[PDB]
Design a protein around this ligand. Sequence first.
Ligand code: TDR
Ligand code: TDR
Ligand code: TDR
Ligand code: TDR
Ligand code: TDR
Ligand code: TDR
Lengths: 246, 245, 251, 244, 252, 245
Amino acid sequence: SKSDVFHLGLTKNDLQGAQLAIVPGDPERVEKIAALMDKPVKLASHREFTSWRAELDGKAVIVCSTGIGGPSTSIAVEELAQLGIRTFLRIGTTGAIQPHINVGDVLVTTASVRLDGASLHFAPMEFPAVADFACTTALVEAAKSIGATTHVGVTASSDTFYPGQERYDTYSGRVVRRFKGSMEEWQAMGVMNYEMESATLLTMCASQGLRAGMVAGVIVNRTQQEIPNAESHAVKIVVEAARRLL
Amino acid sequence: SKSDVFHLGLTKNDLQGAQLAIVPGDPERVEKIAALMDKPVKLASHREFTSWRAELDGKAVIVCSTGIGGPSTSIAVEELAQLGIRTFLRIGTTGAIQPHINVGDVLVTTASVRLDGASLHFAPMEFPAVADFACTTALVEAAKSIGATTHVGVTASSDTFYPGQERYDTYSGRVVRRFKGSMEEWQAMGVMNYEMESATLLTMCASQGLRAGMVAGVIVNRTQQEIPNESHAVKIVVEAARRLL
Amino acid sequence: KSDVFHLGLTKNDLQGAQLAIVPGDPERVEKIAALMDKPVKLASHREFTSWRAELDGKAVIVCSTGIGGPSTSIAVEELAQLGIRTFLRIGTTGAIQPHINVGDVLVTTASVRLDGASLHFAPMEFPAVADFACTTALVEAAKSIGATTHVGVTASSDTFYPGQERYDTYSGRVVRRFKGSMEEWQAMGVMNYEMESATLLTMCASQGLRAGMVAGVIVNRTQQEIPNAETMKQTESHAVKIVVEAARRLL
Amino acid sequence: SDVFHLGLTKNDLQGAQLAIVPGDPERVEKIAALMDKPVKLASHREFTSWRAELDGKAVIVCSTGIGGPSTSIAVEELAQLGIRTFLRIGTTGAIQPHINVGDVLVTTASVRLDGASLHFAPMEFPAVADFACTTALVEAAKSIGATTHVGVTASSDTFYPGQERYDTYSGRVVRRFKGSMEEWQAMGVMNYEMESATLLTMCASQGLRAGMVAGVIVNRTQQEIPNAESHAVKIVVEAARRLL
Amino acid sequence: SKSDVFHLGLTKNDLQGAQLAIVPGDPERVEKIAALMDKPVKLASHREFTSWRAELDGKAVIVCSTGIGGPSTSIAVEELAQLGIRTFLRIGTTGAIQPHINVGDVLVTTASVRLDGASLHFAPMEFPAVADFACTTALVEAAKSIGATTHVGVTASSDTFYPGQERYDTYSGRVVRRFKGSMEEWQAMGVMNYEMESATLLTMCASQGLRAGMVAGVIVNRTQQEIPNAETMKQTESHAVKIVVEAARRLL
Amino acid sequence: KSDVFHLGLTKNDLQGAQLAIVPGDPERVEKIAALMDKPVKLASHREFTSWRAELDGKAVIVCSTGIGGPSTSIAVEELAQLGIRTFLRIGTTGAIQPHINVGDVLVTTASVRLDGASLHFAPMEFPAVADFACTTALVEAAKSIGATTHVGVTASSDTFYPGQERYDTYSGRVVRRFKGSMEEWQAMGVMNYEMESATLLTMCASQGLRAGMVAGVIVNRTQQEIPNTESHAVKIVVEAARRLL
Ligand SMILES: Cc1c[nH]c(=O)[nH]c1=O
Ligand SMILES: Cc1c[nH]c(=O)[nH]c1=O
Ligand SMILES: Cc1c[nH]c(=O)[nH]c1=O
Ligand SMILES: Cc1c[nH]c(=O)[nH]c1=O
Ligand SMILES: Cc1c[nH]c(=O)[nH]c1=O
Ligand SMILES: Cc1c[nH]c(=O)[nH]c1=O
């Protein structure tokens, strides 16, 4: 049963005809998401790529972690595509950069500011990191049905957690010129949030005939602090959206 | 004679509370679009900017031409915004670059490849030239209501009609390095079409808290020919406007 | 009948014309043509209004470009297809140097490429430079008319507002790229802002076409962000006389 | 747990100032076990961290995950906790015809085909390794007699198009990377990997020392996908000994 | 201080009120240019910067070598500007890229393709590497007066002699992607020629209120060969030198 | 007759030399040559003065580059054509770290590419990195004579003035790109400014040639803009050459 793909350790058989994947960043969240669906089965775990299969309305669905960042995301998406996935719904965590966005709010990304590198490996910068219309629609309509506080708009997608998101509470306390004042700039432009995979995901899918949607739960409000203290709606929405896209 | 803006020749009062504008490229289309709504009145014509007011479900609507290209578009949108317009629906013509997108088809742009310069005057290239979700939804729903062969997706928005759209039917018959082989590249990336205002419109709106939608009627298929030779799309943009008031 | 997609013109319409005067504003076309011999209207489609007239026995086209490089690129390309080899732009402009007064005439040697369309003809490193003969004719024409004239670099912007660092706008913001840009151009001795020359000059200089660029100063940005609507016409009259006189020297 | 991702405290490091940073979390324990007193510290996301002792000194082994972004998190958070020297041990695809599978490649500097490096320094800044770290790696390689090459590495944000792999879903490579492998080959670039540009750039621009070593798992002149290299691991540990 | 500037070894006094400098690349050409004017005298020589002073129309004129390339050019121009030079006329050698621009032809540059780095230290790439109108006019008129097959237009100004000018007869025989096919591109765009200082010179002057002109003698046609023939260089050089001096006369 | 267009040198002039020491200043060429056996003048053309000498029975070239990447690229290329495979630059430099003093010796591992010529050999993403053997030899040579030596990154600029953020100039202006740049490089641990290494290191590293870079500090920029290791750095480069033959 040699793997069809280099990193994921999966064969087409493992998908059982699945064409949709829910793709969290954290491998540890994969089982948790899969458990919200019928007949969840662990498939594989290699590096940051943990994969489970489950069933939604009688149809197989994949849950597969991407790890943090465009590079590992690009591997997961490519290899899932090779295996037969055609629709990707990213479920992530995010830092809000608008003052009235609450922790736990669900942010649906229409398109992303490409503060990444991997997107450029699929399309030049001019190309929009835009989500699929059907996927975005499914997410918004799912959000409506469950009644979660939801915001829809543009997301800044960064290759770093720290300087690219203009965090200063760091070892160096320095932010390179490019990102000095960048958060205020994005804020003024109505950008809702920061995360770290959507630019890559959306660009690589939109430029390769794959459908992608992007949703995230807010874990910190950056107008207040750089790092949240210790302590669902977005996940409920991503699963419900997947239902609509089968 | 009075105008609250430098180019359009319009006062805020002329808008009669309008918060939505339909923005075709061609000044000659303005009257045609206005005619589909109630109480159409000509407001002004200056340079490439012809404006009419009309009424849709008891609400004032502006129709104002942008002229061809990001620069004149940026002026029209900015000045309309100064006057109170918050939702912009572009209705254009377009060249399809996908083999199965036919002349007469209606194309709704989710976001644009920024092959323009004006978008960069509002946001750096990294920023997506993305349409407003509500506007795009309204356009897709309007397309269903009117009836059209409709495609939804990415559009290449060029500062030129010729080399930036890799046309060779030109004086020089050549295309700068940047654009050599570019059409086939966009085609491979699933880009539907070329037009000349959406990157500017979508970027300037998305980065300034304005809502923008983008729809165009296909007048040529570029896999077949370079030189082309809009009622469906106009009905759709008007129907979309009705949903966004 | 049209040989070209946008302009609605045929080679027959040019009557052997090899020079075009290209204002941004369609309304100015008739005005420019009125300074020449037996002007006649040819066509009006979108922002492209065209007239033909004569200057000492030679046919000359006057054709508007509309605002911005994109529509300019269409007009110039299609005129080139029709046989035009020399283009003189006559524009309006905002001066950014303190002692360039309203009504002054500015002749552009080359432009700061703050546009996108120029890039569709040549990479950024290529100069948006005017043709030597055209620039010479404009400078000489300025002396013939007797206008206060400055010759030098022009910033050619794809926007009227943020690219010219105007702040009295809907957003009241200017993107990082253009924050402080006006002061920078000022310090570099850039004379003025307008919106078509970068495209015009680049597309011509990279395609064997001759181009010149002249504009009348309708505002000085070191005293006003807003152009005075009533003083614009007389101010532009000098520059219009100059572009026509320059054309006379290039035939 | 106090650093946001790694879940580590300063105390967990017990004074460690050097970290060995593999890409794969599953390799962390394996590397730690080659040294004295290996102890698991934490595992969160792709970040598995162990402590060990080398010649009496505390050392950290911590995975970066694949790519600059996760690397940048691990390096930053380790630096917050006192790590000043980072030795990446990776896998790599060789692009020079005479560089064989099992060969050890020591990177002097990287071609920045990533995005995260730009979050620390503009492109003009060199993704250069620390001289002492590179020296230790080279001398460690010489000590065990491993077939070793020293030079430039192309560090890519993708495994596929950025390394001009065509055996993919789309079979497409974006214009930027079309013909890129041959160009790097002609420029004497030894190999592709996916973290060094970020690692080297972020360290070189922040007063941190970084070294980069990788074991060759495929030669790209032969095939795109590696057949499903303890020399490289031996070398990184021995190099670490010289850097304490 | 026996020098008011760091590299050139000159004081303001040495200029004797000169406001115009002729700036060849080759230190060896400095005396040759000076010798065509009145009261020529050596000033200084440090590194690639050899300076002479002469007189035209009773006005002092500097001749100062720049060395090859934008970097050394930027030093010479800056330090001369500090000393009071406001007008710079470069006289250079050049490779023609157009088929009908021939060895021995004289080329006057209106503006340059910025294939250099130093220009970017004065203005962003969007800014035109454009010559001064009065200077260009004087060079064109000068070329017409003394006799010369003259072309006026755009020049590609490269930081390298080899790959940036798409020369393949080199150690590596390779040309980086950016410059592969570049000569044909410039040719199609009507670019006349390659040289190595004008982008820096023109940009730094046009963006700092200084006047610059650029003239060069064609020593090779690149549609024919990569390396210039030695036989035709001396005559081409002296010919362009006569033109630059005549231009200077018109600008004083 | 010369085998190369600028240097005025033949392969025979080199007498089998495979290493060249490349100072910027033609006037320092003989001074470096005089530290080795049998120094003899080869040629002087433009900024390119070349001598040959002998080190441990092996021929060595000393050849000036002139200031800047452009002239450097000519000298390196033409020397490479004549058989040189190892290039050791010895220069002067302005220190930008407060902990570095005038007379200190700086060995460059890699350079910030603030030049243009490097781009003619490799795109910006490519590292302007020194050869490991050359760097090692320079470091070891430095340690052998006990000179105060720092090893690390160097900012290599196409200008002496604005690119090194000098304001004591005709214009007193520094273009936006370089505004605040010295502080930026300082914070990033960059040791110094000079004007040839980015070109040298990039062109060599991308063409299978070995390059090393060493410089003597003639000013510290935290103290002054304009300068007021002559022997130390020269002794080091010659001793390093010895180890690389
Ligand atoms: C808070 C936060 C979570 N996740 C991210 O990717 N970025 C952030 O800033
Ligand atoms: C046919 C066509 C119409 N409009 C455009 O903007 N581009 C095109 O190609
Ligand atoms: C005043 C003015 C006129 N025309 C322009 O293009 N820009 C300006 O600022
Ligand atoms: C084979 C291989 C392993 N790891 C990488 O990062 N790239 C490669 O090509
Ligand atoms: C022939 C020639 C002379 N001078 C240059 O700068 N480049 C060339 O190609
Ligand atoms: C002082 C100094 C020497 N050499 C340089 O190249 N730059 C400098 O600033």
